[PDB]
């Protein structure tokens, strides 16, 4: 009979040596099973699953009960996906680089580091108590729990490359952005001018341009009627803004921005490095730290600090 | 959910799959990133990935009786085409992507050892890997090792599956085991076993004598008697170890926990080089955690 040697844990520290019978579901061996942040309760054991550690979560366990108030989520697989990915993120190294907490390269965490580095510089707060606890500990150097939560809130698996803008979007859904306000005036000369209002994550993020000043002057976006119109920023009541765009050559001048992220490589297979401005421009590539006065490379996301804004027009 | 599948590994075909039927029922034999995902049902985290589809003529070029080899090779090829292979220090390396920390160290080590592959497909890709086109060679390694793109692998383990297809017929290792109370017997290894060794990083310790428990227990001493190979590979767990220039050929270090770390390649020529994929740094001395050390050799005879 087909067999395999897999370890299963309920504490992420103590392993249980187990033998499973292939052709039979993982859910039939020990119930709800999770591996590297993936709900693997209905998958049959594959050959490439040997020697790996699986997490088991009883449905009767009280940890599933008090899951909402602590994590602010309704997904039943959240606890298992978070605990299984936590077993792998405990193996990562979190070196302090340039005063900020980073991550050593492992399992394509090129994007997870860039997200963690950006959050340390923006004045942001999370409504979920688990995030605020892990976010604090992530700043002290112990960021294993924070990275596992990010993979759970983003429905990702350890080893899979993720997008920074997409991962920040799922994450900021649990952040305190109630007082965030963005007022945009769209001017279609065949439909007059109308004013839209975004609140929350939509008031902070934008996709299309990297320049905050370009948003203030005017960008092109399709109107509802079906033709190109121009829109510019009118009011901004947030602690920061995140500008996004595809990778392209872009000059980064000191003092004009807060931090940024670069992406070198093809679509869905590349490498993120973080750019931050302090006394000089820093380029944090996980554990490596290089300084330069001016950086010109393919950047995708640029952060700007803000308290309040009103147009001059 | 939305799934991409290709039949030529170049042109994608947007396709729709159901949540209740195995991938083998949708397009037949299906493979993803070097993994046979034919009898597997579609999972939630499988959106946006490209799957390869298959139905022969594998043994003559690939030296395998495995049916799933071509699919695993073609699916891993779809992902290895996105990687960059920059020539670093005259050798072809790979920039970090999907935990290929170990694949680069293997490719860098093969360029310095005088080895040749019996399989025609390997020799085709190995030559192109030195010319700069190493996308096909990386896909074959994951197939010969039954690995998946993105998952971290061991260099010593993947080299074992790889060297099984190399010309090691004339490889010979003769070891004399000396148990002080049971006499002495001499074993002879040939092939991959004649090249690799686990336990110490120092070749001089193998020639002088290393400790290994005898079958009846206790501890016995073993030393090298005859070695008829083009190179030897010494391996050991990560530990601090001094690397002197000229005493070795190349080595590989490993920083991090078990099964979650980072491989960097070390090569010795005019000065010590530390190749971290695309990064090139030079230094005089090195003190760090090394796991695999190479030594070049053609023949040896003990003085005792
Ligand atoms: C790394 C990654 C993982 C998952 C997904 N879904 C996307 C990406 C990704 O490529 N992101 C970068 C920023 C990107 C975004 C938009 C257009 C791009 C075109 C070319 C190259 C990069 C591009
Ligand atoms: C990266 C990796 C992936 C898959 C597998 N099966 C193993 C490894 C791995 O850890 N290899 C390194 C060199 C290693 C080898 C031997 C003992 C080690 C003890 C502690 C730390 C590292 C050790
Ligand atoms: Zn209009
Ligand atoms: Zn990739
Ligand atoms: Zn004995
Ligand atoms: Zn890892």
XYZ file of C-alpha atoms and ligand atoms in Angstrom:
667
model
C 0.000 0.000 0.000
C 1.239 3.490 -0.862
C 2.658 5.292 2.181
C 4.595 8.447 3.037
C 6.306 9.953 6.095
C 4.769 13.309 7.048
C 4.907 15.217 10.325
C 1.816 16.817 11.863
C 1.740 19.372 14.670
C -0.889 20.991 16.878
C 1.503 23.404 18.635
C 3.949 24.437 15.848
C 6.779 23.137 18.072
C 5.994 19.475 18.773
C 5.839 17.133 15.774
C 3.949 13.845 15.440
C 5.581 11.286 13.153
C 2.761 9.886 11.034
C 2.234 7.559 8.081
C -0.616 8.303 5.687
C -2.327 6.099 3.119
C -2.383 7.701 -0.315
C -5.604 7.682 -2.381
C -7.281 8.823 0.875
C -7.898 12.472 1.713
C -5.865 14.334 4.339
C -9.189 15.149 6.008
C -9.761 11.427 6.524
C -6.474 10.971 8.414
C -6.530 13.745 11.037
C -9.340 16.100 9.991
C -8.651 19.720 9.024
C -5.072 19.885 7.740
C -3.091 22.927 6.607
C 0.299 23.261 4.910
C 2.246 26.503 4.376
C -0.872 28.645 4.637
C -3.069 26.514 2.362
C -6.263 24.661 3.293
C -5.173 21.141 2.336
C -8.057 19.204 3.904
C -9.454 17.805 0.628
C -6.203 17.074 -1.249
C -4.845 13.553 -1.490
C -1.214 13.075 -0.395
C 1.227 13.707 -3.234
C 4.755 12.366 -3.648
C 6.227 15.862 -3.182
C 4.740 16.075 0.342
C 7.323 13.911 2.130
C 9.165 15.235 5.160
C 6.927 18.311 5.402
C 5.200 19.453 8.588
C 1.407 19.783 8.481
C -0.763 21.688 10.941
C -3.910 20.097 12.366
C -6.835 22.095 13.761
C -9.787 20.278 15.360
C -13.169 21.720 14.445
C -14.204 21.294 18.097
C -11.161 23.277 19.260
C -11.932 26.531 21.068
C -9.320 28.374 18.979
C -11.800 28.317 16.090
C -14.443 29.834 18.385
C -12.759 33.103 19.390
C -11.418 33.707 15.877
C -13.510 36.687 14.739
C -13.039 39.150 17.614
C -9.271 38.547 17.544
C -8.624 38.462 13.775
C -11.682 40.327 12.378
C -12.425 37.648 9.785
C -15.178 35.140 9.055
C -13.148 32.577 7.091
C -13.090 29.274 8.969
C -9.818 28.300 7.265
C -8.071 31.470 8.483
C -6.758 30.023 11.750
C -5.334 26.935 10.053
C -3.806 28.871 7.157
C -2.260 31.348 9.599
C -0.845 28.649 11.890
C 0.511 26.493 9.049
C 2.277 29.455 7.436
C 3.557 30.429 10.892
C 5.465 27.135 11.108
C 7.472 28.205 8.048
C 7.867 31.897 8.929
C 9.488 30.928 12.243
C 12.415 29.676 10.137
C 13.024 33.100 8.567
C 15.565 35.645 9.781
C 14.556 39.236 10.586
C 17.695 41.408 10.473
C 17.521 45.048 11.509
C 18.573 46.998 8.402
C 18.882 50.781 8.528
C 16.909 50.988 11.763
C 14.034 49.067 10.146
C 13.142 45.387 10.494
C 13.620 43.396 7.275
C 13.603 39.720 6.259
C 16.315 37.487 4.832
C 15.510 36.019 1.420
C 13.483 32.807 1.689
C 10.515 31.377 -0.253
C 10.048 34.455 -2.471
C 9.411 36.807 0.449
C 10.742 39.624 -1.732
C 7.349 41.314 -1.479
C 6.586 40.517 2.164
C 9.707 42.406 3.247
C 8.783 45.420 1.100
C 5.331 45.546 2.708
C 6.763 45.247 6.223
C 9.338 47.951 5.478
C 6.693 50.357 4.154
C 4.410 49.944 7.178
C 7.194 50.909 9.599
C 7.406 54.402 8.069
C 3.718 55.267 7.558
C 1.609 56.240 10.577
C -0.967 53.449 10.346
C -3.005 51.476 12.879
C -4.901 48.195 12.540
C -8.367 47.593 13.961
C -7.796 43.861 14.465
C -6.171 43.213 17.873
C -4.029 40.389 16.477
C -2.513 42.646 13.814
C -1.695 45.420 16.300
C -0.008 42.877 18.571
C 1.956 41.337 15.697
C 2.708 44.732 14.130
C 4.276 45.913 17.397
C 6.356 42.743 17.738
C 7.302 43.024 14.057
C 8.880 46.409 14.807
C 10.892 44.969 17.716
C 12.398 42.292 15.457
C 10.037 39.344 15.999
C 8.012 39.507 12.775
C 7.190 35.814 12.301
C 3.581 36.260 13.439
C 3.085 39.395 11.338
C 4.273 37.719 8.129
C 2.023 34.714 8.764
C -0.983 37.011 9.216
C -0.213 38.813 5.951
C -0.193 35.517 4.048
C -3.499 34.576 5.691
C -5.202 37.925 5.047
C -3.961 37.768 1.433
C -4.848 34.081 0.860
C -1.275 33.301 -0.174
C 1.019 30.318 0.332
C 4.627 30.330 1.527
C 6.907 30.322 -1.506
C 4.504 32.033 -3.923
C 5.460 35.503 -5.129
C 2.860 38.156 -4.386
C 2.152 41.706 -5.529
C 2.895 44.483 -3.046
C -0.029 46.691 -4.081
C -2.418 43.728 -3.991
C -1.084 42.574 -0.616
C -1.333 46.081 0.848
C -4.943 46.295 -0.368
C -6.057 43.178 1.517
C -4.063 44.355 4.549
C -5.361 47.936 4.716
C -8.917 46.560 4.794
C -8.225 45.912 8.500
C -6.438 49.225 9.110
C -7.897 52.364 10.697
C -8.797 54.407 7.613
C -12.132 55.799 8.803
C -10.865 59.396 8.691
C -9.292 58.890 5.251
C -10.952 61.104 2.643
C -10.169 61.714 -1.033
C -12.130 64.122 -3.243
C -11.550 63.893 -7.002
C -13.059 66.210 -9.625
C -13.575 64.499 -12.994
C -14.080 66.881 -15.933
C -15.543 65.340 -19.101
C -16.219 68.226 -21.468
C -19.218 66.384 -22.966
C -20.721 65.531 -19.556
C -19.769 68.546 -17.453
C -17.828 68.004 -14.258
C -18.671 65.662 -11.399
C -17.064 65.038 -8.023
C -16.504 61.535 -6.676
C -15.622 60.695 -3.083
C -13.501 57.745 -1.984
C -13.078 56.645 1.622
C -10.850 54.072 3.277
C -8.324 52.153 1.189
C -9.610 53.840 -1.976
C -8.736 57.247 -0.491
C -5.111 56.165 0.033
C -4.212 54.044 -3.002
C -4.171 54.918 -6.691
C -3.017 53.044 -9.791
C -1.673 54.630 -12.960
C 0.995 57.166 -11.991
C 3.866 57.318 -9.511
C 3.810 61.108 -9.046
C 1.630 62.615 -6.330
C 2.038 65.997 -8.040
C 0.754 64.508 -11.306
C -2.452 63.509 -9.511
C -2.754 67.096 -8.267
C -2.347 68.474 -11.802
C -4.539 65.991 -13.680
C -4.637 62.415 -14.993
C -6.744 60.748 -17.680
C -9.397 58.201 -16.666
C -12.393 56.910 -18.688
C -15.744 58.513 -17.907
C -18.935 56.502 -17.470
C -20.277 57.769 -20.807
C -17.341 56.141 -22.585
C -14.703 58.755 -23.406
C -11.485 60.001 -21.848
C -11.775 62.611 -19.093
C -9.339 64.432 -16.814
C -9.426 64.209 -13.014
C -7.339 65.938 -10.355
C -7.064 65.771 -6.579
C -9.225 68.260 -4.668
C -9.106 67.169 -1.013
C -6.925 64.626 0.785
C -7.454 63.883 4.491
C -5.138 60.955 5.206
C -1.858 60.218 6.954
C -0.244 58.982 3.711
C -0.946 58.085 0.089
C 0.261 55.141 -1.997
C 0.846 55.702 -5.717
C 1.174 52.656 -7.960
C 2.041 51.913 -11.584
C 3.666 49.168 -13.688
C 7.476 48.976 -13.548
C 9.112 51.800 -15.491
C 12.246 53.928 -15.380
C 11.719 56.728 -12.874
C 14.058 59.159 -11.122
C 13.860 59.283 -7.316
C 14.910 62.625 -5.828
C 15.616 62.942 -2.112
C 13.015 64.807 -0.070
C 10.233 64.443 -2.651
C 8.923 61.092 -1.350
C 8.878 58.886 1.757
C 9.696 55.378 0.501
C 9.370 53.269 -2.634
C 9.553 49.738 -4.042
C 11.316 48.452 -7.179
C 10.419 45.348 -9.252
C 12.950 43.722 -11.589
C 11.850 40.683 -13.581
C 8.995 39.350 -15.658
C 5.325 39.368 -14.676
C 4.707 37.278 -11.522
C 8.393 36.244 -11.443
C 10.628 39.076 -10.257
C 12.374 40.627 -7.269
C 11.276 43.453 -4.972
C 13.691 45.813 -3.233
C 12.656 48.644 -0.931
C 13.805 52.256 -1.311
C 13.627 54.609 1.674
C 14.650 58.237 2.138
C 16.330 59.427 5.343
C 19.737 61.115 5.454
C 20.461 59.520 2.067
C 18.618 57.152 -0.245
C 18.737 53.570 1.038
C 18.171 50.429 -1.040
C 17.215 47.587 1.308
C 17.329 44.204 -0.446
C 16.441 42.043 2.537
C 19.703 41.674 4.462
C 21.826 43.782 2.087
C 22.046 47.555 2.626
C 23.431 49.923 -0.006
C 23.317 53.723 0.048
C 23.226 56.168 -2.856
C 22.324 59.795 -3.496
C 20.028 59.283 -6.504
C 18.260 56.157 -7.759
C 16.881 55.596 -11.263
C 15.293 52.201 -11.826
C 11.996 50.404 -12.381
C 9.805 51.415 -9.429
C 6.165 50.368 -9.080
C 4.929 51.868 -5.787
C 5.892 55.194 -4.198
C 4.707 56.429 -0.798
C 4.042 60.042 0.187
C 3.431 61.552 3.614
C 0.357 63.743 4.003
C -1.781 65.436 6.638
C -4.276 67.515 4.604
C -4.463 68.955 1.101
C -6.567 71.418 -0.884
C -6.090 72.403 -4.512
C -4.998 75.898 -5.544
C -7.392 76.080 -8.520
C -12.004 29.489 -11.569
C -9.795 31.005 -14.260
C -6.875 28.796 -15.308
C -4.304 29.161 -18.085
C -3.083 26.110 -19.995
C -0.629 25.821 -22.880
C 0.042 23.083 -25.428
C 3.230 24.570 -26.921
C 4.866 26.189 -23.841
C 4.728 29.528 -25.700
C 1.101 30.344 -26.577
C -1.392 30.452 -23.709
C -5.003 29.278 -24.016
C -7.524 30.804 -21.614
C -9.622 27.916 -20.276
C -12.290 27.247 -17.648
C -12.052 24.314 -15.225
C -14.608 22.865 -12.819
C -14.184 22.478 -9.065
C -15.262 18.810 -8.927
C -13.228 17.043 -11.645
C -9.529 16.200 -11.603
C -7.132 17.980 -13.949
C -6.766 14.672 -15.800
C -10.446 14.879 -16.769
C -10.153 18.402 -18.238
C -7.131 18.199 -20.569
C -5.666 14.762 -19.853
C -2.197 14.480 -18.311
C -1.582 17.814 -16.598
C 1.614 19.120 -15.002
C 2.352 22.355 -13.125
C 5.805 23.773 -12.317
C 7.426 20.349 -12.477
C 4.756 18.510 -10.470
C 2.453 15.789 -11.802
C -0.910 17.419 -11.066
C -3.050 15.046 -13.144
C -5.048 13.153 -10.495
C -5.402 16.348 -8.415
C -8.570 18.420 -8.286
C -8.281 22.203 -8.783
C -7.458 24.100 -5.589
C -8.458 27.652 -4.685
C -4.885 28.991 -4.857
C -4.438 27.675 -8.421
C -5.804 30.687 -10.318
C -3.683 32.409 -12.949
C -1.111 29.605 -13.186
C -0.096 28.005 -16.487
C -0.533 24.233 -16.818
C 1.169 22.021 -19.403
C -0.678 19.204 -21.190
C 0.710 15.972 -22.675
C -0.681 12.923 -24.598
C 6.886 9.502 -26.009
C 10.447 8.892 -27.257
C 11.836 9.850 -23.842
C 14.436 7.199 -22.968
C 16.776 7.799 -25.916
C 17.418 11.453 -25.030
C 16.449 11.630 -21.338
C 17.481 8.149 -20.063
C 14.286 7.563 -18.077
C 11.416 5.087 -17.968
C 9.290 7.692 -16.169
C 6.113 8.715 -17.982
C 5.709 11.975 -16.030
C 9.266 13.165 -16.765
C 8.451 15.164 -19.909
C 5.467 16.891 -18.316
C 7.460 17.809 -15.218
C 10.279 18.998 -17.486
C 8.000 21.058 -19.735
C 6.040 22.583 -16.847
C 9.213 23.609 -15.017
C 10.513 24.988 -18.322
C 7.567 27.404 -18.459
C 8.693 28.940 -15.155
C 12.466 28.821 -15.741
C 12.063 30.861 -18.943
C 11.223 33.895 -16.781
C 14.523 33.760 -14.877
C 17.622 35.744 -15.821
C 21.036 34.099 -16.240
C 23.752 36.752 -15.860
C 27.371 35.790 -16.417
C 29.060 36.463 -13.067
C 32.823 36.082 -12.787
C 32.967 34.369 -16.175
C 30.452 31.737 -15.027
C 26.717 31.639 -15.733
C 24.564 32.117 -12.619
C 20.896 32.872 -11.878
C 19.258 35.828 -10.157
C 17.199 34.872 -7.112
C 13.677 33.736 -7.996
C 11.438 30.998 -6.539
C 14.128 29.734 -4.137
C 16.635 28.773 -6.837
C 19.385 29.433 -4.288
C 20.477 25.809 -4.629
C 20.000 25.425 -8.388
C 22.526 28.199 -9.037
C 25.086 26.597 -6.713
C 24.735 23.329 -8.643
C 25.101 25.042 -12.027
C 28.148 26.993 -10.828
C 29.782 23.841 -9.444
C 29.332 21.878 -12.682
C 31.133 24.559 -14.711
C 34.324 24.028 -12.680
C 34.375 20.220 -12.384
C 35.438 18.148 -15.395
C 32.226 16.153 -15.774
C 30.280 14.952 -18.807
C 26.744 13.603 -19.042
C 25.776 10.394 -20.820
C 22.250 11.612 -21.566
C 22.203 13.596 -24.844
C 19.581 16.033 -23.517
C 21.721 16.993 -20.510
C 24.800 17.560 -22.675
C 22.677 19.747 -24.958
C 21.415 21.922 -22.098
C 24.720 21.915 -20.188
C 26.560 23.381 -23.182
C 23.866 26.030 -23.658
C 24.017 26.793 -19.927
C 27.659 27.841 -20.312
C 26.801 29.911 -23.397
C 24.142 31.778 -21.406
C 20.967 29.832 -22.234
C 20.386 27.890 -19.008
C 16.571 27.824 -19.009
C 16.401 24.250 -20.326
C 19.072 22.940 -17.942
C 17.257 24.148 -14.816
C 14.007 22.508 -15.938
C 15.771 19.160 -16.383
C 17.310 19.274 -12.892
C 13.892 19.706 -11.277
C 12.633 16.773 -13.356
C 15.531 14.443 -12.511
C 15.087 15.357 -8.826
C 11.254 15.297 -8.829
C 11.141 18.861 -7.501
C 8.736 21.776 -7.937
C 9.500 25.392 -8.836
C 9.531 27.552 -5.711
C 10.357 24.812 -3.193
C 13.814 24.947 -1.624
C 16.000 21.933 -2.360
C 19.259 20.483 -1.046
C 22.367 20.809 -3.205
C 23.882 17.480 -2.147
C 20.605 15.606 -2.670
C 19.922 17.160 -6.081
C 23.515 16.521 -7.187
C 23.045 12.831 -6.340
C 20.051 12.432 -8.657
C 21.912 14.475 -11.278
C 25.258 12.637 -11.158
C 23.452 9.314 -11.681
C 23.307 10.323 -15.365
C 26.970 11.420 -15.537
C 29.906 9.372 -16.821
C 31.000 7.752 -13.563
C 31.758 4.254 -14.845
C 35.498 4.805 -14.328
C 34.860 6.340 -10.895
C 36.412 4.241 -8.135
C 36.738 4.781 -4.383
C 38.488 2.290 -2.095
C 38.032 2.769 1.661
C 39.758 0.754 4.391
C 37.746 0.424 7.609
C 39.859 -0.384 10.672
C 37.983 -1.732 13.694
C 40.634 -2.239 16.365
C 39.021 -5.439 17.707
C 37.419 -7.004 14.597
C 40.281 -6.819 12.081
C 40.026 -4.831 8.851
C 37.986 -5.158 5.657
C 38.080 -3.039 2.499
C 35.003 -1.881 0.572
C 34.893 -0.468 -2.964
C 32.421 2.115 -4.280
C 31.811 3.040 -7.918
C 29.838 5.800 -9.617
C 28.100 8.552 -7.658
C 29.095 6.839 -4.407
C 32.764 7.031 -5.464
C 32.557 10.836 -5.762
C 30.382 11.970 -2.843
C 31.001 11.664 0.887
C 29.196 12.843 4.020
C 30.724 13.568 7.413
C 33.690 15.929 7.054
C 34.489 18.991 4.963
C 38.261 18.400 4.949
C 39.641 16.078 2.280
C 42.841 15.739 4.326
C 40.780 14.212 7.143
C 39.537 11.537 4.733
C 43.103 10.730 3.660
C 44.365 10.683 7.259
C 41.376 9.007 8.900
C 37.809 9.702 10.016
C 35.717 8.072 12.724
C 32.627 6.016 11.848
C 30.890 3.439 14.081
C 31.592 -0.193 13.277
C 28.674 -2.546 12.681
C 29.139 -4.162 16.117
C 29.077 -0.676 17.646
C 31.960 1.252 19.220
C 33.984 3.449 16.808
C 36.301 2.598 13.920
C 38.753 4.536 11.761
C 38.499 4.799 7.972
C 40.897 6.319 5.443
C 41.057 6.639 1.669
C 43.091 3.974 -0.144
C 42.318 4.481 -3.848
C 40.483 7.277 -5.660
C 40.052 7.174 -9.455
C 37.730 10.071 -10.286
C 37.872 13.481 -11.950
C 36.722 15.269 -8.764
C 35.402 14.630 -5.263
C 32.543 16.260 -3.354
C 32.867 16.585 0.423
C 29.714 17.373 2.392
C 28.749 18.029 6.008
C 26.142 19.959 8.032
C 26.655 23.734 8.266
C 29.495 24.703 10.591
C 32.145 27.401 10.855
C 35.113 26.363 8.730
C 38.174 28.159 7.365
C 38.591 28.248 3.574
C 42.189 28.742 2.438
C 42.882 29.698 -1.167
C 44.498 27.026 -3.327
C 43.559 24.134 -1.028
C 40.157 23.567 -2.674
C 38.314 24.154 -5.949
C 34.871 25.471 -4.959
C 32.398 25.227 -2.093
C 28.842 26.071 -1.080
C 27.662 27.703 2.147
C 24.271 27.731 3.752
C 22.872 30.264 6.235
C 19.503 29.585 7.852
C 17.516 26.865 9.548
C 16.983 23.337 8.258
C 15.035 23.301 4.957
C 14.731 27.126 5.044
C 17.989 28.854 4.152
C 20.036 30.477 1.404
C 22.797 28.996 -0.747
C 25.674 31.104 -2.042
C 28.422 29.812 -4.314
C 32.137 30.108 -3.531
C 34.809 29.626 -6.203
C 38.596 29.841 -5.827
C 40.845 31.290 -8.528
C 42.929 34.460 -8.253
C 41.013 35.423 -5.090
C 38.097 34.029 -3.113
C 34.778 34.806 -4.826
C 31.357 34.780 -3.145
C 28.663 34.452 -5.820
C 25.169 35.158 -4.481
C 23.310 34.660 -7.735
C 23.771 38.025 -9.422
C 25.999 39.539 -6.715
C 29.781 39.235 -6.994
C 32.030 40.042 -4.030
C 35.742 39.293 -3.650
C 37.622 38.655 -0.414
C 40.885 37.245 0.924
C 39.785 35.014 3.822
C 36.470 33.313 4.545
C 35.098 32.030 7.857
C 31.504 30.849 7.627
C 29.027 27.963 7.605
C 29.899 25.749 4.617
C 28.091 22.502 3.795
C 29.697 21.226 0.570
C 33.354 21.543 -0.462
C 34.827 20.375 -3.775
C 38.352 19.127 -4.440
C 39.833 18.369 -7.859
C 41.775 15.131 -8.245
C 42.593 12.377 -10.749
C 44.307 9.605 -8.725
C 45.577 8.865 -5.218
C 47.467 6.167 -3.341
C 48.007 6.065 0.408
C 51.484 6.174 1.930
C 50.803 3.583 4.656
C 5.106 39.932 -8.798
C 3.629 39.673 -9.085
C 2.969 38.646 -8.430
C 1.628 38.406 -8.686
C 0.947 39.194 -9.599
N -0.457 38.944 -9.869
C 1.607 40.220 -10.253
C 2.948 40.461 -9.997
C 3.659 41.597 -10.730
O 4.193 41.387 -11.766
N 3.685 42.932 -10.156
C 4.351 44.020 -10.850
C 4.434 45.235 -9.930
C 3.519 44.369 -12.082
C 2.245 44.905 -11.931
C 1.481 45.221 -13.057
C 1.995 44.996 -14.329
C 3.300 44.443 -14.485
C 3.826 44.212 -15.788
C 5.099 43.673 -15.938
C 5.862 43.359 -14.811
C 5.349 43.584 -13.540
C 4.044 44.136 -13.386
C 17.670 23.575 2.279
C 17.195 22.126 2.330
C 16.124 21.716 1.552
C 15.698 20.400 1.603
C 16.339 19.493 2.432
N 15.892 18.113 2.485
C 17.409 19.903 3.208
C 17.836 21.220 3.156
C 19.015 21.672 4.015
O 18.815 22.082 5.109
N 20.372 21.609 3.499
C 21.478 22.039 4.334
C 22.757 22.106 3.503
C 21.664 21.016 5.451
C 22.082 19.727 5.138
C 22.254 18.782 6.151
C 22.004 19.131 7.473
C 21.573 20.452 7.794
C 21.317 20.809 9.148
C 20.897 22.098 9.463
C 20.726 23.043 8.451
C 20.976 22.694 7.129
C 21.407 21.374 6.805
Zn -18.456 61.715 -19.976
Zn 8.744 32.799 -10.269
Zn 33.801 -3.910 15.272
Zn 11.739 28.404 3.547
